[model samples]
Target: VLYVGSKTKEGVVHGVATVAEKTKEQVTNVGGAVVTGVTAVAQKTVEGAGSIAAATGF
Candidate 1:
C-alpha cells in the first residue's frame, strides 16, 4: 500500500513537470520573449510543491 502511494506521487510530479516545460517553450516561441513573470511563477510552484510534499511526509 505504501509503495503504491509513492508511485502515484511520482507520476503526478512527472506530469506536472512535463506540461510546464512544454507550455513554457510554446509561449516563448510564439511571443518572442514577450511573456513575463513565467520564471517566478515556475519557481514558486516548485517551492510550494516541495513544502507541501514535505509537510505531508511524502
Candidate 2:
C-alpha cells in the first residue's frame, strides 16, 4: 500500500510505529517529509478454507 500527503509550514510533529514482531515488518513515516502521516495497514483474507495463513502487516 502507498500514501501521499502534504507538508505544512508550521507545527510540531510526532510519529508512531506499529510492527508485527513475527514478521519483522513495520509502517514508516515516509521519510518524515510529508506533514500528514501515512500508514500501511495490513489486512487478512480467508484463503481456500483457511488452508494458507499469510501474515499481512501494514
Candidate 3:
C-alpha cells in the first residue's frame, strides 16, 4: 500500500539521520580528548620549566 511505503521510507530516513548524528558525536568526543591531552602536556612542560628556573635561581 502507498501508506506503508511512505512509512518505510520515513523509517529509513530516520535511521540514516541517527547514524549521521552519532558520527558527529564521535568526532566531537575525539576532538575534545585531543584538546585535553594537548593542554595537559603543555601544563606539564610549563611546570617542569618552572622547576628548572627555580633551581637555577632565575
Candidate 4:
C-alpha cells in the first residue's frame, strides 16, 4: 500500500489501492503525487496478493 503523510505538507499516494490502508510519516515528492511512506501485504486469500513494486519520488 501507499500511505502519504507529512509534518507540514499535503499527503499524496498512488500505485496500489488494496494495501493503501497502511500508513507512515514524513517524506514527499513523487511522480503521481507526494508519498511519505508505503507498505505491502502478501495473502493468498486476497486477490492480486504477493505482488512487488515501488513508490519512488520525482
Candidate 5:
C-alpha cells in the first residue's frame, strides 16, 4: 500500500497490482465472450433436438 512502510516494496507491489488488474480485466472480458458462445451453441443443440423430437412424435 501507499502507507510508506516496507521501504521499496511499494514500487514492486504497485507494479504487480497494476499488471495483474489489467490481465484480470482482459481475461474476464474474454471469459464472458466464451460464455455467450457456449450459450448459443447450447441453444442450437436444443433446437436440433426439439426438431427431431417433434418429427418423431417423442
Candidate 6:
C-alpha cells in the first residue's frame, strides 16, 4: 500500500492509503487527509492512486 501519512505520537507512520503494489488495492489518503489544507479543502487524492492518474488539484 502507498502509505502517505505522518508519524504517530509513538513514532508510527500513519496517514492514508492505496495502490503501488502493482495490484488492485484500496486507494487511500482519506483518513487524516494526508495533506492538510487551510481549513477548507476537498481532497482529490483518492481519485489519484487508483484507476485515475494522480491529478493535482484543489
For candidate 5, give the lDDT of residue 54. 29
> Candidate 1 lDDT, tens digit per residue, 1-58?
3464453333122232323434333333432224443232223225334431123322
RMSD of each: 13.0, 17.2, 21.5, 17.9, 19.7, 16.5
Clashes of 6: 3
- Would you list the rank order by lDDT, best first? 4, 2, 6, 1, 5, 3
Which lDDT value does model 3 have at 28?
A: 50
Q: Clashing residue pairs in candidate 5, if any?
A: none
Worst 10 residues of 4 by lDDT: 35-44
For 1-58, candidate 3 gives per-residue lDDT tens digits of 3464453332121222222233232335322222221111222224334431123322
TM-score, every prediction: 0.13, 0.15, 0.11, 0.20, 0.12, 0.16
By lDDT, the better pick of 2 and 4 is 4
The deviation in Å at residue 46 for candidate 2 is: 7.6
The residue pairs that clash in candidate 1, if any, are none
Clashes of each: 0, 1, 0, 1, 0, 3
C-alpha lDDT of residue 30 in model 1: 33
The residue-level lDDT of candidate 5 at 19 comes to: 25
Which lDDT tens digits does candidate 4 get at residues 1-58?
4658735333434357555655557655455444234454333344654335445535
Per-residue alpha-carbon lDDT of model 2 for 1-58, expressed as tens digits?
3437865444434455565545433546533332223444333543554222244445
Could you tell me how far off, in angstroms, the CA of residue 47 lies in candidate 5 after the best superposition? 1.4
- Alpha-carbon shift of residue 33 in model 3 (angstroms): 5.6
> Which residue pairs in candidate 2 have backbone atoms (N, alpha carbon, C) closer than 3 angstroms, thus clashing?
40-58
Rank order (by TM-score, best first):
4, 6, 2, 1, 5, 3
Q: Which of the numbered candidates is closest to the native, going by highest TM-score?
A: 4
Across 1-58, the per-residue lDDT of candidate 6 in tens digits comes to: 4558965353344544544545443546643324322233234335434432244556
